[PDB]
RNA sequence: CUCCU
RNA sequence: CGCGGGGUGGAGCAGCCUGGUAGCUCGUCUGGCUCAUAACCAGAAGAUCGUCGGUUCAAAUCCGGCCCCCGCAACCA
RNA sequence: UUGAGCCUUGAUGUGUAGGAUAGGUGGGAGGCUUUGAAGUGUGGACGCCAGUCUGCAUGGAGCCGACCUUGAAAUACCACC
RNA sequence: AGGCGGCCCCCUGGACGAAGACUGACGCUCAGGUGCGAAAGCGUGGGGAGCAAACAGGAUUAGAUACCCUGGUAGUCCACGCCGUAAACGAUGUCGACUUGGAGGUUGUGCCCUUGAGGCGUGGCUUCCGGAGCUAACGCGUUAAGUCGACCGCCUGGGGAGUACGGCCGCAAGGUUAAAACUCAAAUGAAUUGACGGGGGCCCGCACAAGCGGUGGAGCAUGUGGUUUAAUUCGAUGCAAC
């Protein structure tokens, strides 16, 4: 908004594992205001991600996540008649949430029988650098890196951190 | 313009004198003969000069800050 | 290929494009690269980044002439003109001197009337 | 409904930067207090260079 | 662009609907892609007035014209709408 | 872009 | 009526500059962008390489035969 | 200056497989070398960025073939090209 | 007055000031007349880089005989004639006298400690701000739009109209002089309060951006318009009726 760096509230961590990133991930596919069955989808998917990956579950999810987190993201701008996209760097809070949104959408596609099987296979190919969300990641990097020639005025991401 | 010197050199001096007199006369001469409005633009520029000087001079009284 | 030592790097830096012509001391050309031919097209030619990629794609394909040090002439009041010489400090060259060959007539011919 | 963003200090910066880029070579539309006028003019002079680098 | 005639105290005859529709179609073709148009005809004991609301991509735009015989009011409203459309059209061209 | 009283 | 050259996405053609895997613009299909069309950008399929043969490990590439073009001619029953 | 043709020569011919920038076919365990060896003072070509040619040593008297992988075995050596 | 910008030469006009000398009212204005008069244009002869009406093409657009882009001929240049108009403007005729100040510019000159780019005066031309006074106000304000004097030009509601007819000038384009019928009760100047702007500055809003879920496709419910009917009671209709 115009005003208000807003008084921000935190979230509850995940019960089964010591993670708030995982609780955010439950809140992403928590469709229709119903947390419990989304928790059953996430747990049911990390179990078969462990059996279909061998390694542990939290590192399985995080290694599967860092192959879809982005670095540069386009912002569409128009000046005059043109309307070109300008690469902004993603801030590392927006980064992993923007990854998990693509994982969850690419799991709502892809359709297998169950949602835990779809999301389990989608995280598996996210470890394999093979699935859909890595194609969307590489689309974002190809068009921001393709439109890389724009670093300008003041409407985005002041001096540094 | 012409910068040659020893090992810390090559950028600041040159973009200074280059940028000022270059961008001035090329950005001026790049089009618009005008024949008539250097007269108007110098008249407005210098009337704005005396109005800015007298305006700041009598604006040097107070501002209640 | 000629095994030249020093060169003169002319940079034509107009508004809509920058072209970079690396020549020798004599004044006859060795290799050139433009801000249009580096993949950038139309309005995107008119950026400093396309001038930087132009200076890269000239500074190699003049490797076979073996230039250690070069002068820099820059003609044109364009959006390149400084990123393209940062891209020649960074390209592995020794900059002897930098001049300005922007043609300033002691007003002669009449310019066009262009805008409304 | 919360409080003002970057309390005129580096908002005074980007007002002087936008006003610097879009012409306005007055440098005569600033604030009047010192801690905001200083970087309205700071953004103005940081915007003159960003006008030289582009059209 | 479909057009939606209604009338408060003005009995919309079939010859009245043919003319209004033709005028609106002609205006729509001339200035911009228009999605829907509502026409309201009011009579208040003297003033034959007309309202129109055009829903166009940019948004709503409205005009109103009082006349003498209903037909005159409609003509005024259509010219006003055309003028408004020119403003909206290159208001969202603005290259 | 930084040369005033 | 015999010499030459061509048969490769829908089309124009590279490849055959060296026998070892089929390539570029458009048209056609997405997606981003745009008020929508456009323009820009990023991806994708698009061929048993004109058909039969054979020449060696392996042929779009090399060689026969046929068909289709385009030129050069021979065109004085 | 420069084509084109003709000799005399001299280099070049990494798909896959892999000790390897092996061109084909045939013959084929004999030449290399102290006519002062592998490395490199050296200097290039090629360069399908990995290997081969030759210039001069200060060294100085050494190397492969059949025997490992291949449709193929070695510019180990020679002939015809 | 129009206007006149590299540098040098030749011919030539005017202004200014210091100190004197000289003539002795020789002065001011001026209808008619004569002269000069930007640019465009016209005639003759040259010249033609760049630019650039006309013109072609590409765009843009609903259309685009336009703005934008790519080209491009007259013209722009010179010599000699013509035209004689301009927002030819300071929208302020010329000449003369008088009437508080300030800050500057430029150009001479006098005195004194030039002893230091110093100080005090004095003429000319010029820029801005303001005093009384004036003005409808805006503003003008010793360079007046203040107070006066001499002479000239011009005005008498807006449109018709600086047009027609006639005269004069011009190669032409056209210039000058200059009506009337008709028609309206207004036209106008300056300033004010709003409103408006594809004017500016600042702040804010689910206004955009970042997202979540919808409507528009479907069936059904309910309301409205239309059509029907004997009646389909009446009202609510942009947002702010459905």
Swiss-Prot record, chain B:
GO CC terms: cytoplasm; cytosol; cytosolic small ribosomal subunit
Cystine connections: none
UniProt keyword list: Ribonucleoprotein, Ribosomal protein, RNA-binding, rRNA-binding
Basic residues bias locations: 43-56
Family annotation (InterPro entries): Ribosomal_bS21, Ribosomal_bS21_CS, Ribosomal_bS21_sf
Region described as Disordered: 40-65
Xref: PROSITE patterns: RIBOSOMAL_S21 (PS01181)
UniProt feature, compositional bias: Basic and acidic residues: 57-65
GO molecular function: rRNA binding; structural constituent of ribosome
Record GO biological process: cytoplasmic translation; ribosomal small subunit assembly
Ribosomal protein recorded as keyword: yes
Family: Belongs to the bacterial ribosomal protein bS21 family.
PANTHER family: MITOCHONDRIAL 28S RIBOSOMAL PROTEIN S21, SMALL RIBOSOMAL SUBUNIT PROTEIN BS21
Described function: Probbly involved in recognition of ribosome rescue factor SmrB in stalled/collided disomes; fusion of protein fragments to its N-terminus decreases ribosome rescue in the presence of SmrB.
Subunit record text: Part of the 30S ribosomal subunit. In stalled ribosomes contacts ribosome rescue factor SmrB.
Protein name: Small ribosomal subunit protein bS21
Gene behind the chain: rpsU
From Swiss-Prot, chain C:
Gene Ontology CC annotations of this record: cytoplasm; cytosol; cytosolic small ribosomal subunit
Gene Ontology BP, a term: cytoplasmic translation
GO MF terms, alphabetically ordered: small ribosomal subunit rRNA binding; structural constituent of ribosome
Disulfide bonds: none
Keywords: Methylation, Ribonucleoprotein, Ribosomal protein, RNA-binding, rRNA-binding
Entries under Pfam families matching the protein: Ribosomal_S11 (PF00411)
Gene3D superfamilies: Ribosomal protein S11 (3.30.420.80)
Superkingdom classification of source: Bacteria
Residue intervals passing through the bilayer: none
Additional facts recorded: Has been predicted to contact the N-terminal domain of IF-3 based on footprint studies; exactly how IF-3 interacts with the 30S subunit is controversial.
Subunit and interaction comment: Part of the 30S ribosomal subunit. Interacts with proteins uS7 and bS18. Cross-links to IF-3. In stalled ribosomes contacts ribosome rescue factor SmrB.
Function: Located on the platform of the 30S subunit, it bridges several disparate RNA helices of the 16S rRNA. Forms part of the Shine-Dalgarno cleft in the 70S ribosome.
UniProt family annotation: Belongs to the universal ribosomal protein uS11 family.
Protein's recorded name: Small ribosomal subunit protein uS11
Gene: rpsK
Swiss-Prot record, chain D:
GO cellular component, one term: cytoplasm
Entry superkingdom: Bacteria
Induction remarks: Induced during stationary growth phase. Requires ppGpp for translation.
Main localization, broad class: cytoplasm
GO biological process: cellular response to stress; dormancy process; negative regulation of translation in response to stress
Subcellular location: Cytoplasm
Knocked-out gene: effects: Non-essential gene, 100S ribosome dimers are not formed, decreased cell viability during stationary phase. A quadruple raiA-hpf-rmf-sra knockout strain is significantly outcompeted by wild-type after 4 days growth. Very high sensitivity to aminoglycoside antiobiotic gentamicin in stationary phase cultures.
Pfam family name, one: RMF
Signal peptide interval: none
InterPro entries membership: Ribosome_modulation_factor (IPR007040), RMF_sf (IPR023200)
Key words, A-Z: Cytoplasm, RNA-binding, rRNA-binding, Stress response, Translation regulation
Entry keyword ATP-binding: no
Molecular function per GO: ribosomal small subunit binding; ribosome binding; rRNA binding
Miscellaneous comment in the UniProt entry for this protein: When cells are transferred to rich nutritious culture medium, RMF is quickly released from 100S ribosomes, which dissociate into 70S ribosomes. It indicates that this interconversion is a major system regulating translation activity during the transition of growth phases.
Self-association and partners: Associates exclusively with 100S ribosomes. Contacts 16S rRNA, might contact ribosomal protein S18.
Family as reported in the entry's similarity comment: Belongs to the ribosome modulation factor family.
Protein name: Ribosome modulation factor
Taxonomic source organism: Escherichia coli (strain K12)
Gene: rmf
UniProtKB/Swiss-Prot annotation, chain E:
Protein name according to UniProt: Ribosome hibernation promoting factor
Family per similarity comment: Belongs to the HPF/YfiA ribosome-associated protein family. Short HPF subfamily.
Pfam families reported in the protein's UniProt record: Ribosomal_S30AE
Classification of source organism: Bacteria, Pseudomonadati, Pseudomonadota, Gammaproteobacteria, Enterobacterales
Gene Ontology terms: biological process: dormancy process; negative regulation of translation; negative regulation of translational elongation
Function comment: During stationary phase, promotes and stabilizes dimerization of 70S ribosomes by the ribosome modulation factor (RMF), leading to the formation of inactive 100S ribosomes. Converts immature 90S particles formed by RMF into 100S ribosomes. Crystallization with T.thermophilus 70S ribosomes shows it binds in the channel between the head and body of the 30S subunit, where mRNA, tRNAs, initiation factors IF1 and IF3 and elongation factor G would bind; however RMF is still able to bind.
Phenotype reported upon loss of the gene: Non-essential gene, no formation of inactive 100S ribosomes. Double hpf-yfiA deletion mutants form 90S ribosomes. A quadruple yfiA-hpf-rmf-sra knockout strain is significantly outcompeted by wild-type after 4 days growth. No change in sensitivity to aminoglycoside antiobiotic gentamicin in stationary phase cultures.
Assembly: Associates exclusively with 100S ribosomes, which are dimers of 70S ribosomes.
Chain coiled-coil ranges: none
Source organism superkingdom: Bacteria
One CC-aspect GO term: cytosol
A molecular function (GO) term: ribosomal small subunit binding
